[PDB]
């Protein structure tokens, strides 16, 4: 049984590898060599935030490109006004070690979580004005790594227990739970359709789960380290995965394999964040070298570098409209570039 | 300048004042990370430091200064990822069952893993060898010998510069000093001075437990300032 099952699993893995290799007609480079060069993208700092107290460890852009949510390691969420730089909201968290934060697509709810293993969703449009604990849901036996809102009543979350889960706000329980990975899930990213979402864990692989059914339709197994960041392509057919090996990889849902590996010899520090622009040409990735990089999703050439921060960049995000890019680092300073 | 924008600026200034009032306390407080396996007496330590939650924060005041000890005993076995967030903390208190020789190997492995960590490379790791009474009773009973697990214990000489406590049997002193020497060897390895261990023999009832935290954190901050303030 165990031996025959192991042999069958090995044969299935070899068959999947052979099928993925047969469809590997060519690499993304051969086709992205004719496209004109993108040139240097020299982004300058338009805003400078000086409100955070501890290391900024999370961020996200809501439906409105003017409000920016950012979480600090002291248990504090801050919704900044990107345009006027003012502080729209300040939420003191009951958990000091917060590592994830997201802004609901309706602009009324904001999620957070971390080592507390309890995802807390606060409401911003409360009749009482003050920020209230809307839903402090629990059930995960591990630290929360990322949070993403699917609607005003459901939210997907990834915990250190190796299992992701879609919870319902009104019910406050798991709408659905996905099978556990080989390691702790570290990042999440929703597709434009909100039906499927790809998630990466400590194991060198990324699984594409479905919101309708709890099953990973695809499982990429290309990496040489633990994935710490992941972001979906604006179209939803591909997604970039970043690990601590200082190398990003663009996987595709249709081809079911890596398209291009963004890496450089002078970069030895791991990666912590990955994000795309509204078009997808510019792949932005935060590196532990106290600076962020921006490569060409097609050409893979170094398009720009952001060395404004002074500490390890923790997270970065592009606006829904692409007017600017926010970047939160461990220097307690979040910078908006454009 | 519009009136609503002026009101928003005033709200932002109020939020800045609030965040400054909060940062006052956040800066006047010291962060400590308590680590230890299930066999380790970290629970008894927290019970003694009384001067599905994956994190447990405990505030205790000593010598008119606060200490926020963070105990994590409700998470997965591996801790290479969630440990990164605990950088810049005051100190890391590692607990180990110095009496149970069976788990001593795993305790040393975990200590070496937490010491050679890339993110905690510049973070001191305080060491409390809890459960000294059980260790003394075991080494006096003679039924369990450290030689069975560590061959070096058979060719290990008692330190000449030792400081045996009053009323301690030679075997107890030799065993505790061998444990401390093993820990110091595992620590100094690739230490580079940026971070040093602080082995301390802690009993199960010794009220002077947080005093050890204070005495260790004082020297840790002194050493960290000698480098930042351009002294050494």
């Amino acid at each position, epitope marked *: 049984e165990l031996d025959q099952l192991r042999q069958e699993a090995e044969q299935l893995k070899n068959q999947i590898r052979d099928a993925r290799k047969a469809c590997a007609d060519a690499t993304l480079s051969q086709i992205t060599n004719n496209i004109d060069p993108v040139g240097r993208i020299q982004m300058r700092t338009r805003r400078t935030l000086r409100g955070h107290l501890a290391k900024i460890y999370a961020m996200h852009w809501g439906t409105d490109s003017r409000l920016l949510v950012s979480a600090s390691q002291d248990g504090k969420l801050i919704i900044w006004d990107s345009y006027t730089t003012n502080k729209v909201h300040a939420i003191p968290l009951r958990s000091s070690w917060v590592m994830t934060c997201a802004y609901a697509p309706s602009g009324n709810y904001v999620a957070c979580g971390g080592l507390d293993n309890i995802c807390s969703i606060y409401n911003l449009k409360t*009749r009482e004005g003050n920020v209230r604990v809307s839903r402090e849901l629990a059930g995960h036996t591990g630290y929360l790594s990322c949070c993403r809102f699917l609607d005003d009543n459901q939210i997907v979350t990834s915990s250190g227990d190796t299992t992701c889960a879609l919870w319902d706000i009104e019910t406050g329980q798991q709408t659905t739970t996905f099978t556990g990975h080989t390691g702790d899930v570290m990042s999440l990213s929703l597709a434009p359709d909100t039906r499927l979402f790809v998630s990466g864990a400590c194991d060198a692989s990324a699984k594409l789960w479905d919101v309708r059914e709890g099953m990973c339709r695809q499982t990429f197994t290309g990496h040489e380290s633990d994935i710490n960041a992941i972001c979906f392509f604006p179209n939803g057919n591909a997604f970039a995965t970043g690990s601590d090996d200082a190398t990003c990889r663009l996987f595709d849902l249709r081809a079911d394999q890596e398209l291009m590996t963004y890496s450089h010899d002078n970069i030895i520090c791991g990666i912590t964040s990955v994000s795309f622009s509204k078009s997808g040409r510019l792949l932005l990735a935060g590196y532990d070298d106290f600076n962020c990089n921006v490569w060409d999703a097609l050409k893979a050439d170094r398009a720009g570098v952001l060395a404004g921060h002074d500490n390890r960049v923790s997270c970065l995000g592009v606006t829904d409209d692409g007017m600017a890019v926010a970047t939160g680092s461990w220097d307690s300073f979040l910078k908006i570039w454009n | 300048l519009s*009136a*609503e*924008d002026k*009101a928003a600026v*005033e709200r932002s200034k*109020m939020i800045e004042k609030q965040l400054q009032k909060d940062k006052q306390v956040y800066r006047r407080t010291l962060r400590l990370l308590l680590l230890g396996a299930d066999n380790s007496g970290k629970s008894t330590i927290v019970k003694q430091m009384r001067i599905t939650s994956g994190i447990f924060e405990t505030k205790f005041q000593v010598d008119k200064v606060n200490f926020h000890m963070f105990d994590v005993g409700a998470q997965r076995d591996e801790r290479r990822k969630w440990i990164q967030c605990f950088n810049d903390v005051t100190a890391i208190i590692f607990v180990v069952d110095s009496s149970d020789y069976n788990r001593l190997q795993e305790a040393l492995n975990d200590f070496k893993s937490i010491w050679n960590n890339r993110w905690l490379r510049t973070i001191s790791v305080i060491l409390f060898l809890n459960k000294q009474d059980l260790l003394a009773e075991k080494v006096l009973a003679g039924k369990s010998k450290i030689e069975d697990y560590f061959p070096e214990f058979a060719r290990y000489t008692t330190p000449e510069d030792a400081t045996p406590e009053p009323g301690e049997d030679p075997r107890v002193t030799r065993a505790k000093y061998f444990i401390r020497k093993e820990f110091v060897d595992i620590s100094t390895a690739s230490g580079d001075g940026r971070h040093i261990c602080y082995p301390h023999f802690t009993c199960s009832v010794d009220t002077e437990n947080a005093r050890r935290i204070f005495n260790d954190c004082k020297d840790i901050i002194l050493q960290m300032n000698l480098r930042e303030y351009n002294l050494v």
Partner: single-chain antibody
Framework: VQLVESGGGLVQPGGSRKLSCSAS????????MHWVRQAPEKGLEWVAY????????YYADTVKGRFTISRDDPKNTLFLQMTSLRSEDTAMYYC??????????????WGQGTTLTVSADIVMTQATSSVPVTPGESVSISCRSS???????????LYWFLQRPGQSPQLLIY??NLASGVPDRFSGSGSGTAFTLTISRLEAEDVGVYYC?????????FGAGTKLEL
């Protein structure tokens, strides 16, 4: 959420009076307070404003010197001390909460107010004061202003308040952006100069007085008000 006002009554000319307002159901300090007067058989008129934490205070050019506003945050209360009360002071005063930030709706909750009887800013002018209409039809109230409320930031600093028989003015629109608790029947349109409030389907609860207000400059000025009856 409640704003209960008190302290009104009869006052002789030249006297004084402390109008109090107890707030509950929300963070009183987080919301700036506005004292707005309404003369008998007339429309609204802003009087005073106190920001959060008492960091900023403003009064109308006609009420400066006599009226002074203050707020006790420990008790979540507002006070307005009036001195040398004149004969024109006969009116009903209302306390309104307003929080200012992107996506907010300032002047969202109006208190019941209290009646007190005696014995160059932007002006809002409405064309019609009363429009007869029956349920089922749609209404289009117009509003004119002497200064363009379209600020360089692009925000339409226009507020619509609906005061019903026996109730206080209710916020309809704060910036075409519909207000909270108001059905989608009410809509706003127009440019920075002219404005239009459109009701697609009338109901028995829509009868009342609609007042327009500008918020470009701190010194406010309400319009004459358009009346809708059965």
């Amino acid at each position: 959420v409640q704003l209960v006002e008190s302290g009104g009554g009869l006052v002789q000319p030249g006297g004084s009076r402390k109008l109090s307002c107890s707030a509950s159901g929300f963070a009183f300090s987080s919301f700036g307070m506005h004292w707005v007067r309404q003369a008998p058989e007339k429309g609204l008129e802003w009087v005073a404003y106190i920001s959060s934490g008492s960091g900023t205070i403003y009064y109308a050019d006609t009420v400066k010197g006599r009226f002074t506003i203050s707020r006790d945050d420990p008790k979540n209360t507002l006070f307005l001390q009036m001195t040398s009360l004149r004969s024109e002071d006969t009116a009903m005063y209302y306390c309104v909460r307003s929080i200012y930030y992107y996506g907010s709706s300032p002047f969202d909750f109006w208190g019941q107010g209290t009646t007190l009887t005696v014995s160059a800013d932007i002006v809002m002018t409405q064309a019609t004061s009363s429009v007869p209409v029956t349920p089922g039809e749609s209404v289009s109230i117009s509003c004119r202003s002497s200064k363009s409320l379209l600020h360089s930031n692009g925000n339409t600093y226009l507020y619509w308040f609906l005061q019903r028989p026996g109730q206080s003015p209710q916020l309809l629109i704060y910036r075409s952006n519909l207000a909270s608790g108001v059905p989608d029947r009410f809509s706003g349109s127009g440019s920075g100069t002219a404005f239009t409030l459109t009701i697609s389907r009338l109901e028995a609860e829509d009868v009342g007085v609609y007042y327009c207000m500008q918020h470009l400059e701190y010194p406010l000025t309400f319009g004459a008000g358009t009346k809708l009856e059965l």
